[PDB]
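Q: Predict the bound structure with 2-acetamido-2-deoxy-beta-D-glucopyranose.
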Amino acid sequence: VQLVESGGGLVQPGGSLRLSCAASGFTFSSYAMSWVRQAPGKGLEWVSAINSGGGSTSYADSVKGRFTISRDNAKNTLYLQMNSLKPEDTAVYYCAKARTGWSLAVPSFGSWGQGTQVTVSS
Amino acid sequence: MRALTLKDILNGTFSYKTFFPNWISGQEYLHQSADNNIVLYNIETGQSYTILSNRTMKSVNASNYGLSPDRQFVYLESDYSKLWRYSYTATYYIYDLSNGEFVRGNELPRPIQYLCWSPVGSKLAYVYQNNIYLKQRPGDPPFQITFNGRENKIFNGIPDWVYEEEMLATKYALWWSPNGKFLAYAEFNDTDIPVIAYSYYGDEQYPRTINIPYPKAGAKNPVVRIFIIDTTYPAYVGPQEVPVPAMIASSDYYFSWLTWVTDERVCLQWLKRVQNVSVLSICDFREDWQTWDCPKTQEHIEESRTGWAGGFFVSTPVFSYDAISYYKIFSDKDGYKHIHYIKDTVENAIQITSGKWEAINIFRVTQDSLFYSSNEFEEYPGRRNIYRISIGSYPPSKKCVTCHLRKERCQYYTASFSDYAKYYALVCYGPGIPISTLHDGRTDQEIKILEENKELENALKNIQLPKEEIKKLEVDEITLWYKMILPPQFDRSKKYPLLIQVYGGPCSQSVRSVFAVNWISYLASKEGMVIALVDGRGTAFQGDKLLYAVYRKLGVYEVEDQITAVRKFIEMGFIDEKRIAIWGWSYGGYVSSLALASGTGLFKCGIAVAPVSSWEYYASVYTERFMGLPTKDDNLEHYKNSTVMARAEYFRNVDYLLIHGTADDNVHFQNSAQIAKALVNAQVDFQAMWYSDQNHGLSGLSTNHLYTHMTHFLKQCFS
Amino acid sequence: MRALTLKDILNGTFSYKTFFPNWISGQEYLHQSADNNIVLYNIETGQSYTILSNRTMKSVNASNYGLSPDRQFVYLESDYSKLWRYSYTATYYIYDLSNGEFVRGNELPRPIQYLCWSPVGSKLAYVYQNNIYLKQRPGDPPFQITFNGRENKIFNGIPDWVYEEEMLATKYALWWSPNGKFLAYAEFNDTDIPVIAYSYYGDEQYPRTINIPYPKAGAKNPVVRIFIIDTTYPAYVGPQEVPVPAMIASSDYYFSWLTWVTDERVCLQWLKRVQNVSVLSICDFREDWQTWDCPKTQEHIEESRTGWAGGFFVSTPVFSYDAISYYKIFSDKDGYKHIHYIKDTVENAIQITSGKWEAINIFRVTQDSLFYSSNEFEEYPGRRNIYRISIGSYPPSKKCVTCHLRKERCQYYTASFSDYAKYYALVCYGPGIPISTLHDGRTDQEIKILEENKELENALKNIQLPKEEIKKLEVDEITLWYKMILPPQFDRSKKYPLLIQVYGGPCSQSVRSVFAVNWISYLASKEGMVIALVDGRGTAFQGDKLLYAVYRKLGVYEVEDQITAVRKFIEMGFIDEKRIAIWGWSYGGYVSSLALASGTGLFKCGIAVAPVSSWEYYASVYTERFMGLPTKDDNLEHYKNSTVMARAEYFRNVDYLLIHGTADDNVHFQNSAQIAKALVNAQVDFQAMWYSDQNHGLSGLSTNHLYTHMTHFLKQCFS
Ligand SMILES: *[C@@H]1O[C@H](CO)[C@@H](O)[C@H](O)[C@H]1NC(C)=O
Ligand SMILES: *[C@@H]1O[C@H](CO)[C@@H](O)[C@H](O)[C@H]1NC(C)=O
Ligand SMILES: *[C@@H]1O[C@H](CO)[C@@H](O)[C@H](O)[C@H]1NC(C)=O
Ligand SMILES: *[C@@H]1O[C@H](CO)[C@@H](O)[C@H](O)[C@H]1NC(C)=O
Ligand SMILES: *[C@@H]1O[C@H](CO)[C@@H](O)[C@H](O)[C@H]1NC(C)=O
Ligand SMILES: *[C@@H]1O[C@H](CO)[C@@H](O)[C@H](O)[C@H]1NC(C)=O
Ligand SMILES: *[C@@H]1O[C@H](CO)[C@@H](O)[C@H](O)[C@H]1NC(C)=O
Ligand SMILES: *[C@@H]1O[C@H](CO)[C@@H](O)[C@H](O)[C@H]1NC(C)=O
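A: Predicted complex:
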């Protein structure tokens, strides 16, 4: 399975960004997708999840009301947009594929790519 | 031949020893010899070797040890410091066995309130300042799980005063999964609870104040929540909260117990604030959401029409090998507690044991056997015997493994089992000298004698001991069981003084076949008195009628039973009617004060040690279990018409001795203060004595002082 | 014909009455009749009328009254509520006499801590919530003077605990100018003082905690300031603070006393924290800056080389008619306290009285006469007699007024004087039945008998009372003065048990010629005992050598004096050596405990009621006056050798009884708790008793219980 993430970088606090995830190999539009982040010196933290159809989304309590996740099966792309950033989200973001397409399902520890680094500071 | 002396009892000379193996596998166990050496014993091979020398223990002044299941690391505990009946703090060091040196790099902080290894592997969970920390390896920085722990307000992983003393009777509130991939803990919130404050003097110019959150009868209660967290990736989704049943989360409720079935199946038990109803729930793990679900079809309800639910505590289930069915002890249609087998629904339960006796405990449920305790043998409700039943076999079977081992020496047993029940150990507490033995586990064949107590038997040859008997009386269609202790060279043609020792507490038993050499033994051996203990209605292990006869009426029937027993003893014909006394402790103080002030003219003197004055002054859980809410709508009338103070006028023509400790946290000093004030306001003469900075147990030299004072008082009354 | 009984003592059936006139002018006074009518008596005309009837008093449930200097308003007091030994709160109503109804303007607040009229006019000054208010006329809104009054932290116009109990011995700190032109008050700051906390049980479900700012030995002390405010325009400049002398303000200090001389002259008395230096300063009022000036030339210094300054309290000056000279009582060159007359300089003072006796009090200084008290008559320390001397007359004169009035009935007198000393009243307390009479102020002749206690004399005809004697012993160089109470029909050929009553406190006297029927009278009259009271080193009114002997050596010489007296009594020949006992109360307990555990084998039993165990547990003002600071450099060595606990080993072969009240604010319960702890740690048997929610006095039925219990103990000991 191949997954590539693009976006991110160094941005001042209070700004906004958006990043993309592209997947190949397996069949898209048949599984739920998820966005996970890894902070320096910490473990894996689940951020958000999107259904296989794109109707309902699930968010964590730490990024509620600040992140927006969408998908496009025609281009096989996943988009996550962050707004009103704070100087504690500096981390590397990974794109995760679930194993259940019947409904929403958080992927546990499936495929992992290289992710994209996002650093926020003054 | 010589008689007993008070200094023999005070400085413990005739005390026995027991042997509970510290099982670490199915065939091995650890022990600490009388050399401060830790020795590992293997039963199959028969060899043994030391895993930790006394030099290493003395290097850090350690006093207790704990071995990881990998047998690679040990923890040693020092700086012991007791706080409550069960809780304490200490300092822990970690020793590496492979390299023979202490682990360096990340030392645990101090003091630590609780610490536990995982069932599989070597990873640690501990509690420090009301917060839970997890360590993957003994040489790694800790990972913090909880953040809101605050002193005397929020408790994480440990109980507060109320749950530690009245509900859990342990010092910990965290549990590992069977393979150690999940950790479950409880959080207690004590913020609106009223506070009891008393004075501690110590050694300083100014005394200080001790404050404890303490709910008295009818006050606010703690709030408890239960969380489960993944121990491999704890930062993924964090802790998850276990749902509460809808029928329970409608008013105040309690938390009874937690028990793991498998790595994805857990069981919880809930109690309502009205203790009439109990609920058992089984919850499963959903991997598609990493959460926990408790279906409504997997809830079991237990209720009692005539009293509280269960005995002193609610019974716990023991699950079978298939982890879908379980065994539990509760009362049947005839009011006797027996074993039932539950698969799908409560109404479909199958009764395993039946009769006019009771089943006390369930020890082990193996693939084809069940071990339990009972008092079926010869219809003596004071004995404990161990029975084994075959389950899942084509012919049914049932055997008693302890009722004929040593018939005249041992009739009170307990057991300890190893992994997979390969072997077990039996400990016998009486009525002879206690013994400890190791058994086969498959044929119940004796292997070796762990402890025989030969030195005590050699020391007791030149001493005359009193004679003890256990009998029963049938008065007014009520059966009372009494134990009588008689002096040596007893003669039925003379008259003797009489002393009564009373506890009388609900769900308790005082007439047991247990070996003991204590104060009353000395009193009977040297001072020539006759001692008696009586068990009547309100006690346990005899049926539901006798147990629940005292529901919502405390302090009414115990006094009647004691007086009836005393009258029968007088009718026997060898008791002096002008010299009779009674005494008790912390519930026998209550009963002693109520019986002495009954206006019957039977007792001459009485002693009350740390008694309870009114039920409005005690903890909410214990009081409301047996009495109910103290409101005008429910039971305020009997709350008012049950105190000791209301009988203050009737102490006029008796001798009274009142004893209490000023730093008591269980039964507060205010009880004795109010008793003394009420007695003074009625112009009644009595005697008193207080012990400064002493807890409910009166430990140390206070025990010697107390027993000497009571001996002086009794000798003066019977002169 | 019959002997006394315990109920005759507990119920005060043998008690006397005294008459202290309430002077309102030079020739008239007020009294409260039997029917609760306020009656005004005029001496010159012999006519009486009812200023206030009992109906008005009963209308508002009043219990006390106060009449305005202009005889136009009366304040009535209701809702009494005691707080400490001297302080209390109440509700006050104002009644008009010109029209005859209560005023209904600006009503007073409630409750009020203190209230006082003006010396002239009808101005009012009261204290409410630790703040001072002043009203120009009964019906006018108040004017607030102070704003920073807070509960338990800042006191305005009233003392805190330590000043009220140990220094001022009053309930108020505020004084009017002689013509009501200025008002002086004191402000106490207690922010940094440590707090003693104890428990009050009451009648609720939860006990509560009581906190009092209490400085123990060698701790922080309150801060005091003095202000004076104009009472006619109290907004022109506001309060003004008087200066403190330079030699006093260099370190910690106390405020001893204040006295008004004239409308423009005041006198203040300060004392150093090291309490062997005192300063008296006189301050004038300067109109140029409308302020107060205290010149250096008007400062007088008093110091003691071998002890503290003054007696129990520092003496107070009495000013002359021309108001620039005064008279004061202090030690002379031979070590006896006498009267000195001071005009300009201390070292030029003229001694007025001299001899081997002491002068106790100065009552009144008129334009030509001076009245005072003395114990010179017949060299008997323990008698009080009134003497009058002439000043400003060419031939000196000296008259003893009371030494020959009723020689065999009265030898202990006190006096109360009227305005301008036109008439006065004499009250005699013993050794016969007390009696109060009225005397003319010029010829010192009796004109009326105010009270003579006829009913008590009639009721005492059928009661046989014990015999009392006062005598002295000389051992080597000390003179011990003792009072002995002997039973009726006493015979010297038999042997009797002996009881010693001890107080022993510094600057105190226990052998006096007073009349009393109390517990020891019953003990001698009915139980056939012999009772002894002894006065030795450390007692007052016998010179400075005897008074200052116990300095930094508390609890050493009192025991020696008691033992020497007991040995002499045994040598007398009518005392049974196996039946000797001792008892005391609040420094009687201290000496009693130290004497019982002296290891001499003299006393069989002893009783201590609310004793002091260590001097680090008591208040700073009292302890540091007689013992010094508890620092390593000053007196720490003796602060540790003079505790009851250090002798805990010597209580083995004696009987002990320890009694204390749990709500004692003066001598805290900590002392008895420490004593009990020390006795338990040494394995010593004793008896105890506590009283709940009772202060130092043990008032109510607790007194009955205590005296009955002590009688039981003593009867058991002497059987
Ligand atoms: C106190 O008990 C200990 C424990 O057995 C014993 O060794 C010793 O003799 C006893 N001391 C006495 C009886 O003085
Ligand atoms: C420690 O154990 C060894 C084992 O032989 C023994 O020799 C020695 O007495 C013990 N030392 C102490 C202080 O118990
Ligand atoms: C504990 O209870 C208090 C009120 O009883 C509440 O304010 C607080 O949120 C609770 N604490 C937690 C951690 O839930
Ligand atoms: C338990 O007690 C409550 C209140 O006393 C009562 O309403 C309820 O019926 C009882 N529950 C039973 C008997 O199952
Ligand atoms: C109690 O004392 C009162 C006077 O205070 C007297 O009138 C009465 O007779 C006494 N009563 C008894 C029973 O001694
Ligand atoms: C009030 O005083 C009047 C006048 O002497 C008298 O008649 C009446 O009895 C008294 N009333 C009382 C004391 O209640
Ligand atoms: C009382 O003293 C405290 C500190 O000792 C000080 O802060 C405060 O100002 C003082 N209060 C007054 C002077 O009213
Ligand atoms: C007593 O006063 C003297 C001076 O009169 C002084 O030397 C001494 O310090 C004071 N006493 C103490 C104990 O300080």
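A: The first strand of chain B starts at residue 22 and ends at 23.
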